Design a protein around this ligand. Sequence first.
Ligand SMILES: Cc1cc2nc3c(=O)[nH]c(=O)nc-3n(C[C@H](O)[C@H](O)[C@H](O)COP(=O)(O)OP(=O)(O)OC[C@H]3O[C@@H](n4cnc5c(N)ncnc54)[C@H](O)[C@@H]3O)c2cc1C
Ligand SMILES: Cc1cc2nc3c(=O)[nH]c(=O)nc-3n(C[C@H](O)[C@H](O)[C@H](O)COP(=O)(O)OP(=O)(O)OC[C@H]3O[C@@H](n4cnc5c(N)ncnc54)[C@H](O)[C@@H]3O)c2cc1C
Lengths: 300, 292
Amino acid sequence: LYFQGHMNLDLAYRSFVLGVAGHPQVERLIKHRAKGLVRRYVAGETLEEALKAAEALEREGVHAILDLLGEMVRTEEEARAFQRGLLELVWALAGKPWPKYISLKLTQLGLDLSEDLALALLREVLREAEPRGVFVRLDMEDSPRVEATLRLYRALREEGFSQVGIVLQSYLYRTEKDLLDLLPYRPNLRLVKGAYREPKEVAFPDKRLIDAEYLHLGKLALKEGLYVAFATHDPRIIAELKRYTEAMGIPRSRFEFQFLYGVRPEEQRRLAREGYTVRAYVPYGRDWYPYLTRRIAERP
Amino acid sequence: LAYRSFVLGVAGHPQVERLIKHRAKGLVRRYVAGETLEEALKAAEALEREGVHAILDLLGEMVRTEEEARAFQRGLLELVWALAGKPWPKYISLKLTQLGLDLSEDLALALLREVLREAEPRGVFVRLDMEDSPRVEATLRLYRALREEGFSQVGIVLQSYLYRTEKDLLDLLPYRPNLRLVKGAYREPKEVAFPDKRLIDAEYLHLGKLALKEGLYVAFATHDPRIIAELKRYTEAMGIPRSRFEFQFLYGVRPEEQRRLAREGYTVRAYVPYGRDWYPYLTRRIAERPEN
Ligand SMILES: Cc1cc2nc3c(=O)[nH]c(=O)nc-3n(C[C@H](O)[C@H](O)[C@H](O)COP(=O)(O)OP(=O)(O)OC[C@H]3O[C@@H](n4cnc5c(N)ncnc54)[C@H](O)[C@@H]3O)c2cc1C
Ligand SMILES: Cc1cc2nc3c(=O)[nH]c(=O)nc-3n(C[C@H](O)[C@H](O)[C@H](O)COP(=O)(O)OP(=O)(O)OC[C@H]3O[C@@H](n4cnc5c(N)ncnc54)[C@H](O)[C@@H]3O)c2cc1C
């Protein structure tokens, strides 16, 4: 792939990262000599490590979002196996004296195979989560999956569930309209810039416009009285949202900041000491290596 | 910016001013209509022939006394009376400080009220240009007061670089203000205004979209092509009709974009200065952009 005359840099980087990570020797090397580096960003392979990591965050004033990692689901059986992993997490979280928050992808409950299946399995998760006070975030995947995600979110809201939330991505042209459409749902929103490679036709290609849209949507959601989680590490955006919420007298109980586990941990702590609700998004499970490969292959 | 320093530093010399006035008349006329009202109306006619509208802006020396304030008001009344019966849309801009705002709010209000009384029956729209931050509160006071007295053909300008602007906008919604949105022209401290240009631009887009979703008429007064492209995309995608917003440019600045937007069916206006004290304004047009 070339892009308008010259090599596709984004593709070249991605393909190199992937090619180097997939090399058997590099994978052996990283699992052996880079364990200190990995556990900084990944709790461990088990639910027990993940719960330990959450207790360590809590000790420091920071809350945990637990995100089970799994190889990509391609069969109904694998979606059911993944759901079992999610149920185990919900049950284990049940006792805990702290905020209980999990994140999942609908594709890992078989969305691409059957939307009916995904909804079925998700409702069973929500049935266990809701009475235990476990909050469930539906992570937003790529643009072809947005309509189904909002559809399943609305369906569950309408069946009586409230311990469920959505993620909206500021890089999409469609997001402002999705926000305004969802207003009657009073949704609990995580606002992100967005993680995927999206074409010019559906997403702002300009990083200035992505960041500008983030602030616009964040401010719109706040003025609407929505609870909003600002999931971002951007210090310009964080500083503006702190200035804005303070100037508008938005209570600290109506918004929060969310960081990936291990990313700007001094900031997570600092925001918490300032009275903000801060969460770290904590991946765990046996599929951490492909997962971290992909987060590295996103951008140089 | 070395370019900006040079031009600004050479512009003040009396022999530079004389050379521009005699040998760069084409340069002057690009950015200012002329010294007289008559030249200003000719410039508005020329814009109209190309689908572009005019905002007429009387320039005068800085007002310092009540007598100067009244002299300036008389200039504006002459403009209002001259616009009467012109076939095309009639829009004038003014600074409240030129109506004696720093002298008394009462004076500026009395003078402005007389302008709006002559203006409204003649179909002349009056924009209150926004000045620097110590003047915003008084400006909104005069606006609101005049609205409550029953005037409607009067608009305000809000500047995206100020922290206070979103609250002003929200506070003003019951008035259904006719709005010109600008980035802002003054040097303002970090305590009052975004220091970062990325933030000023983000806030411009945010306020504009907020204003449009509230159903307010908004004039986007900006030359920024990133912002124009985005507002064009957004208004299309959201089905906002072309009769609910417009684009405004300084006279002589991106004149091909002005015509292009007019051709694409957008409402476009050029802000046309005229009057005796045009040399300082023109200096700022040359300085602000490497030119030639
Ligand atoms: C808790 C959480 C949940 C998310 N959920 C989703 C989801 O469901 N769907 C989705 O598409 N995306 C999701 N995202 C990702 C988001 O879309 C972005 O891709 C990611 O957060 C990086 O963007 P950013 O806002 O940090 O700013 P970027 O534009 O990536 O970075 C700009 C500035 O942020 C700071 N920064 C960014 N990364 C780092 C770093 N690794 N170390 C130090 N500083 C950094 C730097 O100062 C940089 O200059 C989530 C992100 C988080 C943190
Ligand atoms: C009709 C009108 C009315 C205004 N009224 C007020 C007011 O009442 N109060 C007030 O404080 N300010 C007012 N302003 C000014 C405004 O606040 C800005 O200072 C001024 O418009 C410059 O900012 P900008 O958005 O054009 O873009 P800038 O941020 O100056 O420029 C951004 C981009 O725009 C493009 N650009 C700018 N100029 C040119 C050019 N000459 N040629 C090609 N590209 C260019 C460049 O690509 C640049 O990178 C008004 C401006 C206009 C046009």
